[PDB]
Structure formats: C-alpha cells, structure tokens
Amino acid sequence: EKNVSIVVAASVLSSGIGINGQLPWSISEDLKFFSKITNNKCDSNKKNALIMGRKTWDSIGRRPLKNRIIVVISSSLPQDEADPNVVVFRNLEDSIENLMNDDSIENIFVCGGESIYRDALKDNFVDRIYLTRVALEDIEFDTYFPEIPETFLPVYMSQTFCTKNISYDFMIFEKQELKSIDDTVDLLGEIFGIRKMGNRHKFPKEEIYNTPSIRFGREHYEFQYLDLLSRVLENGAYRENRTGISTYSIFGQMMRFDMRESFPLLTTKKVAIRSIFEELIWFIKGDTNGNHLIEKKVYIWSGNGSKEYLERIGLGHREENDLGPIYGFQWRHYNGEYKTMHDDYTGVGVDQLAKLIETLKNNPKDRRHILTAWNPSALSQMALPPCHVLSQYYVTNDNCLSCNLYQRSCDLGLGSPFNIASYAILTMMLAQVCGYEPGELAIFIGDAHIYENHLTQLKEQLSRTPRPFPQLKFKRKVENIEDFKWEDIELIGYYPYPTIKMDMAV
Amino acid sequence: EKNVSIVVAASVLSSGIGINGQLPWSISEDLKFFSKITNNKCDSNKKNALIMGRKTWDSIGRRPLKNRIIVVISSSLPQDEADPNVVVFRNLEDSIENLMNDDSIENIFVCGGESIYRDALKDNFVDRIYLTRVALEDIEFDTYFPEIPETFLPVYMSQTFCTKNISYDFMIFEKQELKSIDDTVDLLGEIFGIRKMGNRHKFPKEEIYNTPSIRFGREHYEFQYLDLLSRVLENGAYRENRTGISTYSIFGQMMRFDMRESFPLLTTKKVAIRSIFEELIWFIKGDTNGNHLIEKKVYIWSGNGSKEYLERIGLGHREENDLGPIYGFQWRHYNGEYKTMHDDYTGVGVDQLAKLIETLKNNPKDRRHILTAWNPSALSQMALPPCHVLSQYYVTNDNCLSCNLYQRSCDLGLGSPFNIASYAILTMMLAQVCGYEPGELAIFIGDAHIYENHLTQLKEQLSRTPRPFPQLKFKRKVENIEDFKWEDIELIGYYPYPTIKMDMAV
Ligand SMILES: NC(=O)C1=CN([C@@H]2O[C@H](COP(=O)(O)OP(=O)(O)OC[C@H]3O[C@@H](n4cnc5c(N)ncnc54)[C@H](OP(=O)(O)O)[C@@H]3O)[C@@H](O)[C@H]2O)C=CC1
Ligand SMILES: NC(=O)C1=CN([C@@H]2O[C@H](COP(=O)(O)OP(=O)(O)OC[C@H]3O[C@@H](n4cnc5c(N)ncnc54)[C@H](OP(=O)(O)O)[C@@H]3O)[C@@H](O)[C@H]2O)C=CC1
Ligand SMILES: CN(Cc1cnc2nc(N)nc(N)c2n1)c1ccc(C(=O)N[C@@H](CCC(=O)O)C(=O)O)cc1
Ligand SMILES: CN(Cc1cnc2nc(N)nc(N)c2n1)c1ccc(C(=O)N[C@@H](CCC(=O)O)C(=O)O)cc1
Numbered sequence A, B: 001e002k003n004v005s006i007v008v009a010a011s012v013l014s015s016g017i018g019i020n021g022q023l024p025w026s027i028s029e030d031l032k033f034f035s036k037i038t039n040n041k042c043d044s045n046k047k048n049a050l051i052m053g054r055k056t057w058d059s060i061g062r063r064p065l066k067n068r069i070i071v072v073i074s075s076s077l078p079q080d081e082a083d084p085n086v087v088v089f090r091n092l093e094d095s096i097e098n099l100m101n102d103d104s105i106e107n108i109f110v111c112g113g114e115s116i117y118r119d120a121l122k123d124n125f126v127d128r129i130y131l132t133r134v135a136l137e138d139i140e141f142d143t144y145f146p147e148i149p150e151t152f153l154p155v156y157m158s159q160t161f162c163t164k165n166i167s168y169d170f171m172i173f174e175k176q177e178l179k180s181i182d183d184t185v186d187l188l189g190e191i192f193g194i195r196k197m198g199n200r201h202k203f204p205k206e207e208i209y210n211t212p213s214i215r216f217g218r219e220h221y222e223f224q225y226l227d228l229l230s231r232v233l234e235n236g237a238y239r240e241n242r243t244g245i246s247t248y249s250i251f252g253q254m255m256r257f258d259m260r261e262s263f264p265l266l267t268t269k270k271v272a273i274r275s276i277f278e279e280l281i282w283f284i285k286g287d288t289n290g291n292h293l294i295e296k297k298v299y300i301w302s303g304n305g306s307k308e309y310l311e312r313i314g315l316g317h318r319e320e321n322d323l324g325p326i327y328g329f330q331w332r333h334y335n336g337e338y339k340t341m342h343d344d345y346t347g348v349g350v351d352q353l354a355k356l357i358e359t360l361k362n363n364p365k366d367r368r369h370i371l372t373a374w375n376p377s378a379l380s381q382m383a384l385p386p387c388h389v390l391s392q393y394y395v396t397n398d399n400c401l402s403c404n405l406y407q408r409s410c411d412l413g414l415g416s417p418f419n420i421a422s423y424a425i426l427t428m429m430l431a432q433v434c435g436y437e438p439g440e441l442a443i444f445i446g447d448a449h450i451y452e453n454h455l456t457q458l459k460e461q462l463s464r465t466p467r468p469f470p471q472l473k474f475k476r477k478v479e480n481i482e483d484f485k486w487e488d489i490e491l492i493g494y495y496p497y498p499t500i501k502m503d504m505a506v
C-alpha cells in the first residue's frame, strides 16, 4: 500500500484549472510547489510517479520531469519502452495497480487534468488533495477541477500569498476513514473550578469552531478573527453596557495579520471596504464633521451622532452631526481647544500624524512611533470615547512598516472588521509616504465582545470556510498623506461570501 | 506490561515529603488530585493498585481507599486474606507481580514514602512521575523525595495554584527511551523566504528553549516570559537604538499571567520585589522626584537621572534627578503645566487614578477604565517617554479585576520582570480599594528586545526550570490607595534562583 495524492491549482470559486490547453495564469511559486511536493520522498533509491492525461502531457511539452517518473494515461499513445521516465497506460485503473506493488516507487501523484481528476475521485483512489486556490474568476475556463467529495476534510490552509497582484492559498485535504497530559489537565480542571485559568479560556466547541477539521493548519490569518469569535461564544460573560443591547465579553485578546502578501479584508463576509476608507481619510484630514461622511453616503457615524443621542449624553448644544474632538481631532490637533466642527483649527494642537510621518523616515528604528487618541481632558466633549485608543509603528530591517493597535472595546461583527482593514490601509498609506513596504498588523483588544443581536448573524459567518485574502494596491504615489482618494485604490481579487446585515447598538 | 507511575507531593527545593509520620502541610486540592489520578482508569471491570510502605500505611490510618487496591510493602505485617482491598508483599520487586499474573489490575501507582520511592527509582520500575511541588521550605522535614534521575524528563508544568497562602505546581515526568502538514509548511517556507509570515516568527530552537522537553504542557505562566525571551533570541533583528547598546528586537508580542492563584514574580532569578513596589507607590503618589527613590535605596532611575544624561537629551536646566512629568505626573496631573519636582501640583491636571478608582466601583462594566501616560504635549519635557503607555481595567462577573497593559518598548531582562510585577501589584491595590479580587494580567508589547550585553545572562536564565509562583497578600485594608507601605506587603513562598546582574542601558 502506498499514498496517492492529488496536486491541483484551481480557481477559488468555480475551480477552474485550464483554458485552451494551458493554464489560466502564470504563477511561478505555484509550479515550485508542484516541484517540491512531488519530489518529497524518504528513500533516495526510489522515485515518485506523476500521473497525467495526454492533453496535460502535451501542455508540458512532452518532456520528462527531473527525478520523477511521468505516467501518461492515453488510449492512443504508443507504449514506448525507450524512455524510463515516461510510461503509458491505457486507463487510470491499470496505472494505480501497477504503481503500487512497484517497490521502486514510493509515492503516487495525480495531477493530469479534469478527466484524470474526475475519474480518480469517482473511483476512490485518492488519499490527499493538495489544492492551490487562485483568486481569479472573471476570466474564461474550459477545464475544471471537480467538486471535492464529502469524504474529504480540509486539514490545512496556508496564509494568502501574492504573485503579480494575484492572491492564492495552499490547502491540504485528507480523506477521513501525550494523552496523559490531557488527562491530568482535565483532572486539574475538575478540582479547581474557575480557579484554573484554563477553564476561564476554554477551547471553543466544534459547533462554534470555523472549519473545525483544520486543527493544526490554521495558518490563514482570517482565522485570527474567526477564532476570536469562537472564543467569545465559548467564554463570553453576559454583561450589560451603556446601550440597551447586552454583549458576551472576554478580556485580553489579540489578532495578528500579514500585510506583505495580502490585505486583511475578511472573505467570510462582504466587508464595506469603501466606507472603511472614507472614514480613515476623514480621520487623517483631522475632520470631525459627521456630515462629510453622510455627504459621501457613509452612515457609520449617524447613530452616535444624532441630535437625540447627543442630548442623551449631555451634548445638546452641538450641531446635528458635530461629533466633537475625536479620532480626527486628536491625530492632528491633540490638546487643541475644541469649539465646533466649523472652526479653523489649523496650527492649534499637536499634529501627531505629521510628527509620526516625519519620525518614521528620519528615525526609523526609534521605538516611540506612537499615535494616541486617548485624551482625558477631552473625553467629556467626545460623542464617543476612542475605541482604538493607541497605535504604535515599527520599521523593520528590510524597510517594512508594521503596526500595533490597542483597542479598549471591540464590537466583533461591526467595528472589528472595520478596524482590521482601517489600520491596514493606514499602515499602507504611511508605508508609501515614508518609502517603505507594508509589514504586519497586530490588534490587541481589551473588551472583545459580541452584541446579542449579532449571534445568529455571526454564527452564520462561522459556517463559511475562508477564502484567500484580496490585494490592495495604490494607483499613484502621493505627495501628502491627505491627498489619498477612493479612486486611487485598486482592490484586486476580492471574492467574499454574501454580505451579512447587523444592526449597530447606539 | 503495564504502566507504573509515581505520585508524590514534595517540597520545592529540598523535596521534603513528610515529618514525624505525617505531611508537612494540609492541602485539600492535592489529595483530590491524588484521588483523581489514582482512580483514572479505562476498564470499569479493573482496578488500580497503590503501592505504599508500612509507615505510610500507618499514616493513613490503615484504612482502605475506595475503588482501589492498596499494596503494602512490609517485612512484618501478616499476609492476611481477610481484606481483599489490602495486600502485603515482603519486598517491592515481588509486588510488581501485577504486570504478569494479576490481569485484574490496569495501572500501578507507587506513592509510599522515601524508602519505597528511592528503591523503585533505583531499580528502574517507574515510567511516570506525578509531582506536586509545594512551596514550603523553611520548615522541618525528615523524609524526602529522591532526586529525579536524568532518565526522566518533564513534559508538563501546571499553573501555580493557591491553598491557604501556599503555592504549588503539578508536573509530569516521563522516562525517555499527521506529519503531512509539517512537510507542506516546510516546503512553503523554502519557496517563499521571509514572504511567509511563519518564517518571520520561527519557533525557537532547542538550544534557546527553556526546559524544551515540556512541549505541550507549558501551562506555567512564567513560560509566557521565558518563551518570549526564546522568541526574541530566534527572530530578533539586530538594531541600533538611542543608547550605545544595540538590541535584538521583534515587534508585536504578548504575555498573559494569572493573578487569582498566584503572583507573577519570576522565579528563574531573584527579582528585587521591594524596588518594584517602591517605584509603584512612587508613581501612585504622583511623585517625579528621583531622589525619593534613591533615599529609599532604589537606584533604578539613577541612570536616566544623572546630570550628564539630562544635559545629553537637552534637559540641562533640570536638577540632578528632576525626571520631569512622567508616569506619576500623568496619572495624577494629566495635562498639568510642569515646572520642577519641588512645586505643589495638588489639584492641577486630570487625576486619572482618582477617576479610575471612582469609575471602577461605581460603573464596573464600563469598558473605559483606562489609565494612560502618553501625553505628546509633555514628551519633550520627560527625562524618558513612558514605556508602559496605557493600561485598561475590567471587572469580571465574579468581581475580579483584570488588567491589560500596552508597552511600546520592553527591556526583557530588566524592565520586563519589573513591569510584570508592577502592574500586578497595581491591579491588586486597585482590587482592594474597589473591593474586588485579583484577576488576570495581560501585557501587549510593541518593541520586545534584548540588549546585547544581556545575552549571556538571559541564556543563563533560560537554563533554569521555573518554580511555582509565590503569593502576595496585603497585611491591612487601606483607606486611600496612596497609603500603602512596604511593611503592608507579605510575600509568601518565594524561592527563586539566584539573582542575575544585568547592566542598564542609559
Ligand atoms: N491547474 C492545474 O493544476 C492543471 C491544469 N491542467 C490543464 O487542464 C487542461 C487539460 O485537462 P483535460 O482537458 O481534462 O485533459 P486531460 O489532461 O485530463 O487529459 C485527457 C486525455 O487523457 C486520456 N484519457 C483520459 N481519460 C481516459 C480514460 N478513462 N481512458 C483512456 N484514456 C484516457 C485521453 O487521451 P487519449 O485521446 O490519448 O486517449 C484524454 O484525451 C490543460 O489546460 C491543462 O494545462 C492540467 C493539469 C493540472
Ligand atoms: N508527601 C507525599 O506525597 C508522601 C509523604 N509520605 C510521608 O513520608 C513519611 C513516610 O515515609 P518513610 O519514613 O520513608 O516510610 P515508608 O512509607 O517508606 O515505609 C517504610 C516501611 O516499608 C517497609 N519497607 C520499606 N522497604 C522495604 C523493603 N526493601 N523490604 C521490606 N519492607 C520494606 C518497612 O516496613 P516494615 O518495618 O514493616 O518492614 C518500612 O519501615 C510519612 O511522613 C509520610 O506521611 C508518604 C507518602 C507520600
Ligand atoms: C501537470 N502540469 C500542469 C500543472 C500546472 N500547475 C499546477 N499547480 C498545482 N498546484 N498543481 C498541479 N498539479 C499543477 N499542474 C505541470 C507539471 C509540471 C510543471 C513544471 O514545469 N514543473 C517543474 C517546475 C519548475 C519550476 O517552476 O521550478 C518541475 O521541476 O517539476 C508544469 C506543469
Ligand atoms: C499515601 N498518602 C500520603 C500522601 C499524601 N499526599 C500526597 N500528595 C500527592 N500529590 N501524592 C501522594 N502520593 C500523596 N501521598 C495518602 C494517600 C491517600 C490519602 C487520601 O485521604 N486519599 C483520598 C482523598 C479524598 C479527598 O480528599 O477527596 C482518596 O480518595 O484517594 C491520603 C494520604
């Protein structure tokens, strides 16, 4: 008995693998993966066998692959014995029976087009599936990869990679047919109740774990958000808050995302990326006028900015959407004497963002690149205290800009998908203006919570296996960071699940 | 062949297990652990065998244990058949007959005093060791647990638990004699270099991993600091900084500690706990006069408070140790016009700490319990910008006080052990003044680094297997939080490794 794995690079949605006898794409690193996964063997005196159909054998030039043995499935090709690295069989079945019991062969790989993929799964010959999900769908395919049978479960999903602005994943699918430590920890959990901290951070149950079959291969960094949801649904304490909608809350959580090879925009739900940007540039410009977002069809600050809400918190003297000194005011005019949203605050206050950009490129290894928004002297004047209170930035030795954010209160479901992408765009903006590349984004959270009217919505989101992250590139290089416009943003390869409506708690 | 494990509760240093025919302590949760570990079986029609010496059989009243079979090793006790739950053997070797003959026994446990522990290890009869390390050493013992032979390696170390102000651990020692995901992840790391985020966060090598045999049982929360050291020594980028001493730096790390059942004071080195307190109460009183610490034999702010250093950073107008508006000033007088360290700042500024204590007990579920020290309007006047910039506090549903701290720059080796205990004491002080209990402490770190002159020292610290955390209790309840004194603090059960001298980078 030996192992028979499928290697395939297919589209993310329709599972397309070819067009007009060739690939729909040219990804160098993906072919390198095919090379390394098919050469992976234990015995140096053995070789791996690569099974492929004739039309696929034509697409690779009918030339052998080093250190491997190509098995071509063809009804017409002559069974030439002159080439030992290429053998022909009349059907797929006689090429599995012959490869196994052939001690010179260690592993078997199926990789030969739709006709071979489809008949290898229908006849139950395949043990593993190496899938490369490529985020390209608005093009034309003519050969597809069959739908993965239910007998297979995913066990690994890599981080999203980027080649020529094309996002792709790497997944492993297995066919589903030390313990003394686990016993002792369970016994200690019975003796001590909540006294054992492990019981206060119980591992989420399978019913609330997104794609629970991926146990050890949760490399895709959207799991940093999906698993935080699961940890809240498992350990969240039911608590009241300033609004009429209670939450399930835990304390002290973190999420980290890559920004070099992808953009952390959630794929399990269509995230309103346009509104995220318009709010971010609204912060950068130092603007606290809530109408300037409503004038651009962005209504995320209408609830916390209505006349009825402001009178409720004792700010009835403000205009209809005068949010007061908040994120935008503290970034550009810290400790500035706020009057109204119509006054001219040029020069007043401490321009943190300007000093940040100046310090990022003049003293890159300075570990004080800090942008804060928590000003106790102005909290009473704010329509809402800052949720993302403090961010720190870091220039790596390879000229990348990483970002750390501390968030005191995190509305998973509404605020969190925005904060993940918002500070991701901000770091990219800071990276271009300072002449660096994007690095990493880590979000440290205080009150990570889920509003009780988001439960059926967020549980629906957990039922969706993540897709590769999109790409975010800028159309032009900007002089000043304030000059960014929405038209200057290109969102490449974003194929999310349908949007999920969730009401905001005012 | 069947499993033979040792269950023992011994002292932390001298490994004392008894005195005058009884235990040196009375810990209820430990006996329950003995009960659950010796009753844990797979077959319901089988029983576990507990081997013990005669003197131990006397200490438990010569009465059977439910659902188990006691095996007494005695040269004088008659081999009476009237009790089926108690059997006597003339030597330890002839009592290991449960492996061969008596199939009715599923597991074997040795737990019967020094004479039985010592010759059971000398004759290589033991497979596992369940160790309960009790932090009691300045008392009298007369029977000890033998030194664990090198053939055993620790595989688990629980968090520190507390019973009647006594700290204890739980450890497992083993006798030393699918991987398709790991291959795929390794290959992806060869294709993409630093592009794969996993390669920028490499798992530390065994040569720098503290107690590397404990792979899956790193529950003791001192590992949250020791593994951060290893994570820095593995991925730390060599970088220059404001001092003449370069560091190995990574970005975006976190440590979380329990405070309910223990106090996070590092045991791998004798940490100057008194200096940590005297600095913290110095912060609480709003004091920025560096002499008040030197007058109390606390010299941690002497380097950043020399006349030569102050002139170097452009503060030559200050007195010898006028550190300027820092942690203490921003906590009690935020946005206060600082003059010198001799002026009376009573009433000026925003007293965050007073508002924090006021809001903590009046609005416990308010997710805005934030104490910040990052004031950009005053950074230029500070002798050193705040390293621990922002802390948030959280009241759990069971009336516990958890704490989150964001630290922009973390000197592992000097500042970090201080920052761990400092904010642990601060959270405990806030818990008493507000009427709560200690909860959890999480420290989110930006620039986690190791100064290059701390390398040989921190590698020495990593060679020391951690010991259970101590306990920190207050002698009296205080009226105002400022009234705490060093004599009001009791440090119970702190048995650390010898101190490690490390020079501070000015
Ligand atoms: N993205 C990816 O991972 C991959 C993509 N591709 C692409 O897919 C396309 C090719 O796939 P596809 O169109 O399905 O062609 P195939 O690669 O599946 O090859 C089919 C040929 O194999 C022979 N064959 C197939 N089934 C049998 C059978 N049951 N008995 C006997 N002979 C059989 C036939 O040749 P004959 O007429 O001689 O009998 C048939 O024409 C190309 O574009 C290729 O580049 C290919 C591999 C991988
Ligand atoms: N903290 C913990 O986990 C534990 C602590 N203890 C403590 O340890 C103390 C007891 O230990 P200890 O003083 O060493 O006494 P032991 O419990 O080890 O019992 C010793 C007796 O066992 C018999 N015995 C021992 N070796 C042999 C042998 N080679 N052949 C025949 N008989 C043998 C002898 O009894 P005889 O005279 O009849 O021949 C001997 O007096 C007590 O204080 C007890 O509370 C005990 C167990 C666990
Ligand atoms: C069968 N076929 C089509 C093809 C293309 N992309 C794929 N991508 C994936 N992920 N899986 C496949 N099965 C796959 N198959 C192939 C097979 C090998 C090579 C190839 O040139 N392999 C070289 C790769 C050389 C390199 O790029 O480093 C090797 O050394 O194996 C190209 C197309
Ligand atoms: C042999 N002996 C001395 C003793 C005391 N403390 C220890 N502690 C540890 N961790 N390991 C031991 N082997 C150990 N042995 C014993 C053994 C059993 C009981 C005992 O009362 N056991 C009850 C515990 C009942 C309970 O508190 O729930 C049981 O059900 O097993 C006391 C002393």
Ligand SMILES: COc1ccc(C(=O)O)c(NC(=O)c2ccc(Cc3c[nH]c4nc(N)[nH]c(=O)c34)cc2)c1
Binding pocket: A269, A271, A272, A275, A299, A300, A301, A304, A384, A411, A413, A414, A415, A416, A418, A499, A500, A501, A502, A504, A505, A506
């Ligand atoms: C996922 O589904 C969708 C689809 C579309 C949109 C969209 O804007 O088009 C969307 N976002 C929102 O509605 C949204 C609203 C407010 C904020 C910021 C904010 C200010 N005050 C707050 N108070 C609380 N409690 N929570 C918060 O998040 C905030 C962010 C997002 C969500």
Ligand SMILES: COc1ccc(C(=O)O)c(NC(=O)c2ccc(Cc3c[nH]c4nc(N)[nH]c(=O)c34)cc2)c1
Binding pocket: B269, B271, B272, B275, B299, B300, B301, B304, B384, B411, B413, B414, B415, B416, B417, B418, B499, B500, B501, B502, B504, B505, B506
């Ligand atoms: C672990 O071994 C020992 C033993 C004894 C002592 C002891 O004081 O007795 C000790 N601590 C220190 O020397 C020490 C010095 C300064 C601080 C705070 C601080 C202010 N400015 C800084 N600048 C940098 N770069 N780093 C920093 O840590 C700080 C904390 C600790 C360490």
Ligand SMILES: O=c1[nH]c(=O)n([C@H]2C[C@H](O)[C@@H](COP(=O)(O)O)O2)cc1F
Binding pocket: A241, A242, A385, A387, A388, A408, A409, A410, A411, A412, A415, A416, A418, A419, B367, B368
């Ligand atoms: O950027 C934001 N991120 C966020 O998580 N919230 C949510 C968190 C919480 O639901 C609410 C904060 O209100 P409070 O912390 O005062 O209870 O806003 C709001 C934002 F604007």
Ligand SMILES: O=c1[nH]c(=O)n([C@H]2C[C@H](O)[C@@H](COP(=O)(O)O)O2)cc1F
Binding pocket: A367, A368, B241, B242, B385, B387, B388, B409, B410, B411, B412, B415, B416, B419
């Ligand atoms: O409480 C402290 N914590 C801490 O980690 N440091 C260290 C971190 C770093 O080595 C230095 C901060 O100086 P800077 O970050 O400006 O380089 O002090 C200092 C303190 F006072």
